[PDB]
Design a protein around this ligand. Structure first.
Ligand SMILES: Nc1ncnc2c1ncn2[C@@H]1O[C@H](COP(=O)(O)OP(=O)(O)OP(=O)(O)OP(=O)(O)OP(=O)(O)OC[C@H]2O[C@@H](n3cnc4c(N)ncnc43)[C@H](O)[C@@H]2O)[C@@H](O)[C@H]1O
Ligand SMILES: [Mg+2]
Ligand SMILES: [Zn+2]
Length: 215
């Protein structure tokens, strides 16, 4: 099961990834998580990635493609993987097509979670994230059981630094620009599937899981 999740910032990629992982346990490969970890530990690639992230810009394609190519070469990706947030440019999609050729592999689906851009700033500025397990919640749209507390592991919820209004405006503009050409690229391959991201979280997943049924 070789999958890509795509979607504009705040459409609900991470939320659906956790469900897909919870049910199928395929590795979750998130370029955002990889960069964020690189930052936590002060590698030079991490420190250079931070300046783009802080501004809501994309990290350059060469860097991103390099780390994905190395990550997909591991034994845990031999039977399946869930790419989350990569590709997000056509150039990344071309790279991925060729990385996969090198490995003797092919994508099964690119799952695009669609939500109108005009709803998305609200989704990110109100997001709260578990410090321990990374599960996400939203103060209005999807709150936790107890204010301040993750329902999964009990950890404390924080605001991600790039979920600032100004950074969010730039992330939506940057990703909007990249999205239509990427959609066209995969629509031509035949394995792009669009999911209505406006529905409730379980129903979105239901729609995704209809596709994943043939493992
Ligand atoms: N490939 C690449 N190339 C170059 N640079 C790269 C890169 N990948 C990453 N980067 C760099 O790293 C940065 C961060 O990238 P990354 O971490 O990938 O962020 P992103 O793509 O902006 O996605 P987000 O995590 O913001 O949103 P999400 O859709 O996953 O939302 P969630 O499920 O939490 O949901 C959002 C909110 O909505 C809520 N919610 C979700 N679903 C629903 C629903 N159905 N109903 C109600 N509320 C919902 C949630 O509770 C939550 O509060 C980039 O800006 C860039 O700088
Ligand atoms: Mg995410
Ligand atoms: Zn948690």
């Amino acid at each position: 099961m070789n999958l890509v999740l795509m979607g504009l910032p705040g459409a609900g990629k991470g939320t659906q990834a956790e469900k897909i992982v919870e049910k199928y346990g395929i590795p979750h490969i998130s370029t955002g998580d990889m960069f964020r970890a690189a930052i936590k530990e002060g590698t030079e690639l991490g420190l250079k990635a931070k300046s783009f992230m802080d501004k809501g810009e994309l990290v350059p394609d060469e860097v991103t493609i390099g780390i994905v190519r190395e990550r997909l070469s591991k034994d845990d990706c031999k039977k399946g993987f869930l790419l989350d947030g990569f590709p997000r440019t056509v150039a990344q999609a071309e790279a991925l097509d060729n990385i996969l050729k090198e490995l003797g592999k092919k994508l099964d689906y690119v799952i695009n979670i669609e939500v109108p851009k005009e709803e998305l700033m609200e989704r990110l500025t109100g997001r709260r994230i578990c410090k321990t397990c990374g599960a996400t919640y939203h103060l209005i749209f999807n709150p936790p059981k107890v204010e301040g507390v993750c329902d999964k592991c009990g950890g404390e919820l924080y605001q991600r630094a790039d979920d600032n209004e100004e950074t969010v405006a730039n992330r939506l503009d940057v990703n909007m620009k990249q999205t239509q050409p990427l959609l066209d690229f995969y629509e031509e391959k035949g394995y792009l599937r669009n999911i209505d991201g406006q529905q409730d979280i379980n129903k979105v997943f239901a729609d995704i899981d209809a596709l994943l049924g043939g493992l």
